[PDB]
Amino acid sequence: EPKKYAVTDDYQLSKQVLGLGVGKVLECFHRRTGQKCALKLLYDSPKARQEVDHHWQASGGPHIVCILDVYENMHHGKRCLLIIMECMEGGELFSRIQERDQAFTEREAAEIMRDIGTAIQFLHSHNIAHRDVKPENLLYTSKEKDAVLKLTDFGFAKEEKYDKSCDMWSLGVIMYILLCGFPPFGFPNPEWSEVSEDAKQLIRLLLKTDPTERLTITQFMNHPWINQSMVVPQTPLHTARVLQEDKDHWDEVKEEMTSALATMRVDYDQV
Numbered sequence: 558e559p560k561k562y563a564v565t566d567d568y569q570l571s572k573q574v575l576g577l578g579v580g581k582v583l584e585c586f587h588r589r590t591g592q593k594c595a596l597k598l599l600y601d602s603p604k605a606r607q608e609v610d611h612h613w614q615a616s617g618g619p620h621i622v623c624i625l626d627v628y629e630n631m632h633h634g635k636r637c638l639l640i641i642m643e644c645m646e647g648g649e650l651f652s653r654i655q656e657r658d659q660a661f662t663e664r665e666a667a668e669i670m671r672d673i674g675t676a677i678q679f680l681h682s683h684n685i686a687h688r689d690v691k692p693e694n695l696l697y698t699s700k701e702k703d704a705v706l707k708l709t710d711f712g713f714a715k716e717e718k719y720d721k722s723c724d725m726w727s728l729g730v731i732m733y734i735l736l737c738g739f740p741p742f743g744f745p746n747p748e749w750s751e752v753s754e755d756a757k758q759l760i761r762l763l764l765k766t767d768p769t770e771r772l773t774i775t776q777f778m779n780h781p782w783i784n785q786s787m788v789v790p791q792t793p794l795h796t797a798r799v800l801q802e803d804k805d806h807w808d809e810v811k812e813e814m815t816s817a818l819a820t821m822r823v824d825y826d827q828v
């Protein structure tokens with residue numbers, strides 16, 4: 558499966574960065590095709606081998622960034638693994654919402670959450686917990702209206718009912734920000750004034766402090782706000798405007814969510 562000849566035989570590399578994982582992400586081009594792709598460089602290790610394994614197994618599933626190829630090469634005198642993936646040129650979910658003016662509606666947020674749920678559903682049914690679902694890892698395939706949302710980065714993935722409930726918590730957090738533009742770290746007025754009863758009820762079941770009480774993915778996907786996302790109200794949301802206004806605090810919000818997820822993966826935690 559993993560190619561053992563030089564990646565640069567098949568791809569022309571850039572110095573240009575597209576992202577940063579727990580391996581950094583480079584733009585590259587396929588030599589035979591010209592196609593723009595993305596390269597993640599991982600230094601070989603148990604953790605790197607597991608990321609490769611889990612992403613490969615997930616690759617091809619609904620709303621997951623596809624792996625095109627894996628190389629095992631020498632670089633700077635070290636063994637490394639290069640993951641080639643489709644180029645997610647639309648970038649980050651919430652950066653795309655921010656750039657809309659254009660009405661962003663509750664029905665639209667419901668389709669995005671359903672998109673993410675279908676990814677989690679696929680993962681959980683193959684007994685993979687992702688464990689780091691967050692803004693940096695939710696990407697669009699292109700900049701056009703028909704771009705597809707996909708999940709990436711299997712660096713914290715694990716193949717526990719507990720581990721799976723950390724993905725469910727992520728889903729609640731992502732849904733919360735999507736409907737209002739700010740994180741849960743109450744449904745305050747006026748941002749939340751006109752939001753679905755159904756949407757607020759689903760968030761509460763996801764953000765349950767007790768992990769054993771959180772909704773499962775099967776239960777998420779069966780919720781009317783997900784299952785019947787196409788008949789959710791088209792009510793104009795504050796999200797894009799708030800994201801725009803709060804843009805100077807966005808890095809802080811990401812850091813907090815990252816910190817929160819890492820806390821959830823510790824073997825032993827404070828009370």
Ligand SMILES: O=C1NCCc2[nH]c(-c3ccnc(-c4ccccc4F)c3)cc21
Nearest residue numbers: 575576577578582595644645646648710
């Ligand atoms: O594994 C990861 N962790 C953190 C951040 C991260 N990002 C990627 C990634 C993958 C594919 N494509 C892109 C991309 C392409 C063009 C423009 C903008 C983009 F985000 C980015 C993968 C990872």
